[PDB]
Amino acid sequence: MIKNILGLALGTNSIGWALVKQDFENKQGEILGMGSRIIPMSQDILGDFGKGNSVSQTAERTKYRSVRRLRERFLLRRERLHRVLYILNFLPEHYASQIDFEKRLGKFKVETEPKLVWKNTDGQFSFLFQNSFNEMLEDFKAAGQELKIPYDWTIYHLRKKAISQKIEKEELAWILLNFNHKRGYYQLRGEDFEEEKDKTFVRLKVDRIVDSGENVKGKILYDVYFENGWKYDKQVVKTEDWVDRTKEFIVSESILKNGETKRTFKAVDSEKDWIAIKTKTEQEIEHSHKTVGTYIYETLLQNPKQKIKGKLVRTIERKFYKEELRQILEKQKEFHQELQSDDLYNDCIRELYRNNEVHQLTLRKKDFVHLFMEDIIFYQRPLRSQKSSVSNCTLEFRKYKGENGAEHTQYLKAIPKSNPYYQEFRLWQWIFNLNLYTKDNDENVTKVFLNTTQDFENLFEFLNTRKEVDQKALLKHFKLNEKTHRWNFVEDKKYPCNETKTMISSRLDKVENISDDFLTRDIEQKIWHIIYSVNDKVEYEKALKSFARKHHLDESSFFEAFRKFPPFKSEYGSFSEKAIKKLLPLMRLGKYWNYAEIDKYSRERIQKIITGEYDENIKDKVREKSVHLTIENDFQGLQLWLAQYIVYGRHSEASMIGKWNSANDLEVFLKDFKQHSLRNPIVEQVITETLRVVKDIWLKYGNGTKDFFNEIHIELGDTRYISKYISGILSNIVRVEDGSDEGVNSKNIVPGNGKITTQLKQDWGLNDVWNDLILPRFERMNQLTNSKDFTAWNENHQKFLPTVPIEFSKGFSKKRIDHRHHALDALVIACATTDHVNLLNNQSAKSDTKRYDLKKKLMKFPKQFLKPWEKFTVDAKHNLESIIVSFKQNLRVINKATNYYEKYVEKDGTKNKERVEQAGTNWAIRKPMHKDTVSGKVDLPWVKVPKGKILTATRKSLDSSFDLKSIGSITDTGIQKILKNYLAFKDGNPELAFSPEGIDDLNKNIEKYNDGKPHQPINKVRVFELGSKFQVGQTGNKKGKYVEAAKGTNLFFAVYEDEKGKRSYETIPLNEVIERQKQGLTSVPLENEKGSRLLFDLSPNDLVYVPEIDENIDSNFVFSNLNKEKISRIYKVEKTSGTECYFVRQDIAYLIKQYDAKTKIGELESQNKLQVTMTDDRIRITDTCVKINCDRLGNINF
DNA sequence: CGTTTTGTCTCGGCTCCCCGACATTCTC
RNA sequence: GAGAAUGUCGGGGAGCCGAGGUUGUGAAUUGCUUUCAAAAAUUUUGAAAAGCAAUUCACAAUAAGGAUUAUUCCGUUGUGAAAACAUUCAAGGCGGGGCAACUCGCCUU
DNA sequence: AGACAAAACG
Secondary structure, three states: OOEEEEEEEEOOOEEEEEEEEEEOOOOEEEEEEEEEEEOOOOHHHHHHHOOOOOOOHHHHHHHHHHHHHHHHHHHHHHHHHHHHHHHHOOOOHHHHOOEEOOOOOOEEOOOOOOOOOEEEEOOEEEEOOHHHHHHHHHHHHHHOOOOOOOHHHHHHHHHHHHOOOOOOHHHHHHHHHHHHHOOOEOOOOOOOOOOOOOOEEEEEEEOOOOEEEEEOOOOEEEOOEEOOOOEOOOOEOOOOOOOOOEEEEEEOOOEOOOOOEOOOOOEOOOOOOHHHHHHHHHHHHHHOOOOHHHHHHHHHHHOOOOOOEOOOEOOOEHHHHHHHHHHHHHHHHOOOHHHHOHHHHHHHHHHHOOOOHHHHHHHOOOOHHHHHHHHHHOOOOOOOOOHHHOOEEEEEEEEEOOOOOOOEEEEEEOOEOOOHHHHHHHHHHHHHHOOOEEOOOOOOOOOOOOOOHHHHHHHHHHHHOOOEEOHHHHHHHOOOOOOOEEOOOOOOOOEEOOHHHHHHHHHHHOOOOOOOOOOOHHHHHHHHHHHHHOOOHHHHHHHHHHHHHHOOOOOOHHHHHHOOOOOOOOOEOOOOHHHHHHHHHHHOOHHHOOHHHOOHHHHHHHHHHHHOOOOOOOOHHHHHHHHHOOOHHHOOOOOHHHHHHHHHOOOOOOOOOOOOOOHHHHHHHHHOOOOOOOOOHHHHHHHHHHHHHHHHHHHHHHOOOOOOOOEEEEEOOOOOHHHHHHHHHHOOOOOOOOOOOOOOOOOOEOOOOHHHHHHHHHHOOHHHHHHHHHHHHHHHHHHHHOOOOOEEEEOOOOEEEEOOOHHHOOOOOOOOOEOOHHHHHHHHHHHOOHHHHHHHHOOOOOOHHHHHHHHHHHEEOOOEEOOOOOOHHHHHHHHHOOOOOEEOOOOOOEEEOOOEEEEEEEEOOEEEEEEEEOOOOOEEEOOOOOOOOOEEEEOOOOOOOOOOOEEEEEEEEOOOOOOHHHHOOEOOHHHHHHHHHHHHHOOOOHHHHOOHHHHHHHHHOHHHHOOOOOOOOOOEEEEEEEEOOEEOOOOHHHHHOEEOOOOOOOOOEEEEEOOOOOEEEEEOOHHHHHHHHHOOOOOOOOEOOOOOEEEEEEOOOOEEEOOOOOOOOOOOOOOOOOOHHHHOOEEEEEEEEOOEEEEEEOOEOOOOOOOOOOOOOOOOOOOOOEOEOOOOOOOEHHHHOEEEOEOOOOOEOO
């Protein structure tokens, strides 16, 4: 009779919901509720997630965290270097005097920026190494270049000198810190590739392109030849860009089995390709037969103008730096007795590892070279263990009681698929599944070649000795042939065949000098564990040697065979090793099967089932299936399902169906939901918000009572992911426990389709209602454009229908320009019965009669469907006209964070490493505090700076976007003179003057554009801006960094009112809000400077009501008589700046037309949003607006 | 004051866990 | 419909590293402007200082900040009034692995 | 590419 129907329409970031109480038989019913919950998401994300580009806040957070981690590790390395050098007494006194060695070990003292080589005496800075600079000057003079060079170039002179001569210890400390700065490229695993690994960057010139008589696509493909005598692997067609062209590749050469090089090719571009640049730089360094430091020094001697950082040597292999540092340290150890002292080395070890005795003892066997290179500077941590994230077994659990007097479950991790147990398990399954057929007649020729246990044992033995089986091999084993039979499985596919044991056996046969019985099952497992667990080069080699020593095997060929074992691919089965060990005895047969190897419980169940007795743990389906298992010996070679049941007592997964008896169950499910459990954050957010909305609807309209929702209909309209998951979750609310409703989804869940929705909307008149609803916007557009092209008259209906001109019809949609249509969709989905979906999905009737009943019951006479009730259209219009869209807000600023860090704790007279919690109140800022770009503060006497504003400058590349207006924004006036002269010389065309060729020409002949006076080359210039930027911080040089508020951080907009009644508006910066919230105060000050009391604060997505011009809303309240007129005056905050707040009418989702600078028209002017009302009154919203509060269901919380 | 225009951090490598969609064989 | 095995194509998360850029300190060279402060004929040449830079080098900071002395970290994710949490999380035993720290397994509550 | 935040423009 009376049925409560909940229709849901789920979008990318929208949730339309409708609740109706329908009685279809009597054509009665009513709409209980409608609404649309919006999850604000910029169109950038909506357009990006379709293709996908780091579309995740979590990803950005992780990127920032990784950058911070690298920075922190560099700082820690510097601090440890400082401590070690201080103990060694290598730091200069003035430099060490400003470093803390008592409390903040190795850190610079607060408000100091010491430099190792610049000594400050009474405000004058002096270079520290004068003699080295003089020697460098002698070098340059001998090179005949100049004698005026920067002092800090001495670092490279020292680096070259340190290789073969004594240098001062302070210079050595400088070199060590510089080495710490730049570490180079290094891969943790390593695995030196093909011995040749040519990977040589070469530049080759094409000699001729011999059309190789290869006509393809109506054109003869040409080959290529190079002066060296090489032929390009691929053919060429466009000869214009290949004829005598000096192209560059990365060629890889491999000595093929025949005994020749298999040279490949890979076209690259220098100064654009990472690999090409790296290889070219490395080859240049190598060909000089000199260290990287010496290479840099000599290049700098040749060309003093050369850029080093970012131009000459960018990323290179860490081996170069390591070799140079090793050479320097080895040479300098001969001269400085401090590097030979054991007492000082022990002191340094104690300083660094005062609490790690094991590491101290390990280091006591090394020297300073190892300490500086391997321990401090070039130490790279290994990857964190991921084995904690491995899936759990679905069968085997363990139960234990914690200190809280409870009993909870520990899970068993799944088995790696490289484990021999898994290999045998899979092999037995595959053997049982196999069956043969004959080509001619396609008959089950099996049961004739695999009938007795002997045949199965023969097949199992044949398979074990392999790593892969195919059509031909399997057919041959039986002596059969391809010309007469087939193996059911794909006729050209291969299957894994116990590869682990194969590989181990092959690499153990290659060792020779061992009897052909060494490899047994236990040895196989031990070797597999050695290979799988020790994933580190040195560790792996030591483990291999130790294994070859414990077992009397020659560790010369063995190590060589097993030193290049390919690591096992990362993959895990469904079950754990315990479950597989339990199941295998059942699955084995023949000589591999023995009764004593079945666990006690399984043997008991076998005894019970053979006895035919009664056990509550044994189901009747069992005795149906295990009828043939009369005797104990029948329990051989059982397929996975049977053995799984026998061991565990459940016929695979039976599910639970479940039933939620009140809203509390849904609340618990929401509470226990785990983040990152679904495909992507978007669908997870939509789903979770849908569940919250459903819970709110349940509580509001049914008090959370059991079985309130008679039916739930769903629609989506990529997004498909939320089609079945949501249905499965929601089936727990509308399930039936009488047994009639069983399955993945309850029969009360009725997914729809677009066909029914659109057809019903057309037939029920909802399209007319929607068009009448949206018409006034198009009338307003007509008025704005002073035309009549946004509304088209039709005489069949005798009225105006909204329309858009063709030029603005790119992606226009009459439905997408308003949020409320989501609710409308839900309504159509809540009134479409299972009869409607069946009728319009299976309209193919095979006979008019059998579906004529549905046509009569549902369609007026097949023309149109009957309305759900008489006043359905009127009710739908009235309900749509009074919907307040609810928007989700994200106002997180500060949130408590917990920090657990490793530390040595003294317990029971012993130091033990454990995780300690950081004390105090450490907040976490949940918004970006500023933009990345940083500008410096300047004062230009030729620029007027109004009070309250500052000039800030930043470096920009000189390009074609520099005309006179922008040339006038350069802080330097000499550069402005030069650029103006050059631009005038080029007919005032920046496209010609400031192109790369133009810039190079200007730099060549700068004299001519500077009145004959020399100037340095110009590549970048500091452009300034007059505004209000704030300092990043207050400590150190952070006071000199000026930045701007980040996007979407103007979250608070205060509105105050004086005693007179006048209103004042302000925008609270993020930092002030952070401080106020940390202090425990309100986000907005309760009084401004003038002392005006705060009326209220606005945030993005908040809702305000703008009273009519005549209305005097001072203490109105009465927020229940919300007719359409009142709802038409509800606006939503969009953005804020200064004293300006922008609004959009709450129902508007997309503009009919956006704003373009060319035509200069838009629905809401240039900002796509207005400070005033859309109506003709055009009144400032903030002058009379009053805030309102709405819940998820769109009810005003007056 | 009311409106528009402008500018916005960028690129490289490799490892190891999970989920899902679609094919194949087989069992219940 | 559920499950096991074998592949292809996508997505999510976490982790170990690399190279620039920007701002700021110091420096080498060359410029523009102003002021001093001379010499010369309102104009021209010279020293100093300040402001603003350009090319190159070393160095500091790189989300404000808060711990810690472990070769550790927390700060841009989610929930939500508890400014409270999620994203580490028990005990044993029997082994593999290493120069040892530490890492990988199996077994019972 | 998008949309905010603010300088820039009358």
